[PDB]
Design a binder for this molecule. Sequence first.
Ligand SMILES: CO[C@@H]1O[C@@H]2CO[C@@](C)(C(=O)O)O[C@@H]2[C@H](O)[C@H]1O
Ligand SMILES: CO[C@@H]1O[C@@H]2CO[C@@](C)(C(=O)O)O[C@@H]2[C@H](O)[C@H]1O
Ligand SMILES: CO[C@@H]1O[C@@H]2CO[C@@](C)(C(=O)O)O[C@@H]2[C@H](O)[C@H]1O
Ligand SMILES: CO[C@@H]1O[C@@H]2CO[C@@](C)(C(=O)O)O[C@@H]2[C@H](O)[C@H]1O
Ligand SMILES: [Ca+2]
Ligand SMILES: [Ca+2]
Ligand SMILES: [Ca+2]
Ligand SMILES: [Ca+2]
Ligand SMILES: [Ca+2]
Ligand SMILES: [Ca+2]
Ligand SMILES: [Ca+2]
Ligand SMILES: [Ca+2]
Ligand SMILES: [Ca+2]
Lengths: 204, 204, 204, 204, 204
Amino acid sequence: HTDLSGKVFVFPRESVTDHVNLITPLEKPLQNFTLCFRAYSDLSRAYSLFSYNTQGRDNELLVYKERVGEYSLYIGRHKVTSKVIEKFPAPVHICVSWESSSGIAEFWINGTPLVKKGLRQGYFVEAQPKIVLGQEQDSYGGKFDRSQSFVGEIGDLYMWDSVLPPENILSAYQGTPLPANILDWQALNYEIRGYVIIKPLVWV
Amino acid sequence: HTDLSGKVFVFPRESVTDHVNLITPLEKPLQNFTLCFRAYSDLSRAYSLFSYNTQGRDNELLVYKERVGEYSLYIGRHKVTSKVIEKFPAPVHICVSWESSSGIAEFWINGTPLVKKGLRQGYFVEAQPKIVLGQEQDSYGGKFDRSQSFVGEIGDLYMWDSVLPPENILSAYQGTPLPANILDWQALNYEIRGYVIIKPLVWV
Amino acid sequence: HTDLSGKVFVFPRESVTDHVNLITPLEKPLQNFTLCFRAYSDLSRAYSLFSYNTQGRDNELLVYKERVGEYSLYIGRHKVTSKVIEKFPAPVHICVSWESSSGIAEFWINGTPLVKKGLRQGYFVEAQPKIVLGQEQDSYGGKFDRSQSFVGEIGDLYMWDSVLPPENILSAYQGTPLPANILDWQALNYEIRGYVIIKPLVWV
Amino acid sequence: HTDLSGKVFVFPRESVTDHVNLITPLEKPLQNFTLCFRAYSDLSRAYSLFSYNTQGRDNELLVYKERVGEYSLYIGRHKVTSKVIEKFPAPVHICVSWESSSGIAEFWINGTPLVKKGLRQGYFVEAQPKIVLGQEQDSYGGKFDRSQSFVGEIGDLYMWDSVLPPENILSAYQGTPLPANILDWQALNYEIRGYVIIKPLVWV
Amino acid sequence: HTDLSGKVFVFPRESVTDHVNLITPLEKPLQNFTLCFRAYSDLSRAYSLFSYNTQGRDNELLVYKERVGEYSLYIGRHKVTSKVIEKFPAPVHICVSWESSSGIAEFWINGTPLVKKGLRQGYFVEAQPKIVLGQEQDSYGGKFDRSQSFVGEIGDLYMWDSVLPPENILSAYQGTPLPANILDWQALNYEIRGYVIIKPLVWV
Ligand SMILES: CO[C@@H]1O[C@@H]2CO[C@@](C)(C(=O)O)O[C@@H]2[C@H](O)[C@H]1O
Ligand SMILES: CO[C@@H]1O[C@@H]2CO[C@@](C)(C(=O)O)O[C@@H]2[C@H](O)[C@H]1O
Ligand SMILES: CO[C@@H]1O[C@@H]2CO[C@@](C)(C(=O)O)O[C@@H]2[C@H](O)[C@H]1O
Ligand SMILES: CO[C@@H]1O[C@@H]2CO[C@@](C)(C(=O)O)O[C@@H]2[C@H](O)[C@H]1O
Ligand SMILES: [Ca+2]
Ligand SMILES: [Ca+2]
Ligand SMILES: [Ca+2]
Ligand SMILES: [Ca+2]
Ligand SMILES: [Ca+2]
Ligand SMILES: [Ca+2]
Ligand SMILES: [Ca+2]
Ligand SMILES: [Ca+2]
Ligand SMILES: [Ca+2]
């Protein structure tokens, strides 16, 4: 594990090969979660932000950007889309949460709450995942698409096993998040597979 | 009755089923009224905000959003439309009032007064209603349309039997309204019929 | 005569009947004038603001709005048009002045001076008029058109027999005008003929 | 020899008649100049702002507005254009300087410097001119057009036989200029031909 | 060498002839660099900013503007493009850096960092160059193109043999840069070949 504080993963070109694999010891399936990160891209096409696929289970947990202003969350093949007013090109802090009991999906872009949507109530997002950044998975760890690739900079990635209250999301936005148990940017276990460079975070 | 202070009804998807019925003991017909609420939607199509229908009397009292900036009030099949400058998508506080004697309809969007229009002078809006949120009624409690459905978040619903002065509308906007006698968000008698979740109000 | 201070005439619908006649005991013809008022409409089509017609003399003195930003003054069948940057929909304070000696027409929208235009130098605008608001006249007191009708709110109407200096126009804009001799909103002699309601001025 | 300070020339209509001739004792040809004025027009089409024509030479010195955000300078029939961000309709202060040794043309719009352009290096702009305002000349003091005429207001017109530094430019924009040797608004010899009125400067 | 402190090179027209050659004693090839300058143009088409070509090696180091908001860097025939929000027309301060080890290219427009891109990792940009401003080279010192020509003003050109930290880029933006070893605007060795004039920098 590495402390990636004040650092970023830079995906410098468009490809179907460059990605980062993220290792987490997930034995038990997800009921509740929150996922916070910082992203900087000048791409006007659609791309993947966070791709989580389980064994023969595609789009199990996917954070997808459709176009400028439109954000999508996939929970088990099913999607949900919410809109926001944003500047293109500009740095963005994204927080996304989901809860099984209600089926509610919360998106927070730049510490601002988007309209709540719901999908897959009573569902459990499966354990033992292949988590990739920079690429969208269409299988367990592979089957990438160049048109869905992320070219840009990714930082401040934290994932919790609970639904974070408004105060804690703003603490993450302000750059002082609470301890994260699934993924922590301060104790990150990663794997770089192609052309992905670690550089200091200069845009916050 | 429930106190729904600091809470919201979230209509998480588009359907022709999900709605909330609101129960009020209306014996005598309406001459004067004010109706205040908070709404948050990222829908660019037309939808209903407040649907009140009486026994064989469709669009008796309807608050309808046409498109971005355009708001409509229906008093007994007859409509009236007023315009405003607004951001899409964004949280909105709506106040609408009507008076029988003059026929005047006042709309206040974000504590800002819109151009006064008039309809149905000398009319009485009938008692014993079926009041639904999330859906538009084309009968007494039913006959819904998916294209007119509200997907989003509704909060701070208050209804009075009088025409509220400018000072009181701003008190409602500021989040400290005067006692409401038809409907009160602090003592709400409701019925949830499908997929509608109660969550905290995070957008004020 | 009535004191209409802090009040407005509300033309609540589109029609070819609803209007207000304004009575003024002048029958000496006009050389110089200033005309100040407040208007609030969400109409995107063309309409009349002030219609003054004399015996067999149409468009003798007409304040006409063409579209958003464009204002027209008619002095004896002859028109003059000036442009401005304005928000739609929004409250507006209009001042218009004309002088016979030079032929100069001054328009002041929200206390801001527009480009000076000239028409009908050496002309006298005739006495004994039929002054209507809410409708455009095509005869002496009648011959209205629904497409030229004003639906909205009119307030703070004052008319003087002189060309007002910049300081006095701003005093009118600020809501403290100097004594008016043709028409005074503090001592108004009017006639309502259809559906026109008096309500308090809530938009200043 | 008239003090026109706090006053403006108004060209009230579109014609092929109305112009103001400006007289100056210039006997020697110009190698260096600076020309300062204020203009207010709501014309969308192309127009002449300042026309200087000598015996046998059309477009000797011409300040021409092409469209919104586009200013042109003609030196001895040769053209140069510069772009700017500006609001339509708006009052403008224009500063144009030219130097023969370098060929450099310097435009200043509302105290902001434009991209320097070059034309006619080594040229001497001919003496004994016919200087007109409101119209574009095709001959010595005549041969006008209706489509290039100025409808609007001109004020604060000064002309120097030197290239003025940034500080002097800015003081002219502030409304505290340096005394001018070719044309001075505070001691001007002019000639009104047709319908052109002198009214006070109410704008900037 | 000359002190060009508070001065600018003005390329006053479009041509295929006017350019400035910049002489630097480069014996050894470039691994790392930073290149800072100020540019002012009202051209809406594509142009070259900095052209560096080596012996039979076109687009070895090229700073190219595609359109408004889009900036390109060429390292050995290979390009990289990044986007920004900018006003047209407006003065701009550009900083561009490249590092061989990582292949990372950093663009800073008005002291604001753009999205990092990568190209040509492990490459060395060759020595003994022909460096031209105002024109794009398609050979060693020549083969220009009218459509790729820069018309405008260039200033504050500094080039270093290292990748400059964020603090130093802002020092360059603020107008107080650290000592430059490849090119220094304080001690510039240049050659003017056509119509290019030296004038004071009035736009900072
Ligand atoms: C959204 O419409 C379609 O959805 C499928 C499934 O979901 C993703 C993100 C994917 O997994 O590749 O895209 C697929 C396809 O390319 C899109 O046209
Ligand atoms: C507005 O034009 C039409 O009005 C009718 C009656 O009113 C509502 C709101 C309704 O009750 O369903 O819509 C109906 C229809 O779908 C619209 O095209
Ligand atoms: C402006 O063009 C035309 O002018 C005439 C005369 O003037 C008014 C305002 C009027 O008196 O009805 O409109 C008339 C007509 O409808 C317009 O198309
Ligand atoms: C970008 O597409 C093409 O690239 C080549 C190579 O690179 C430059 C800048 C050049 O060296 O002239 O332009 C060339 C051409 O004109 C462009 O259409
Ligand atoms: Ca997939
Ligand atoms: Ca895919
Ligand atoms: Ca209905
Ligand atoms: Ca319906
Ligand atoms: Ca008429
Ligand atoms: Ca008419
Ligand atoms: Ca000419
Ligand atoms: Ca080239
Ligand atoms: Ca080329």
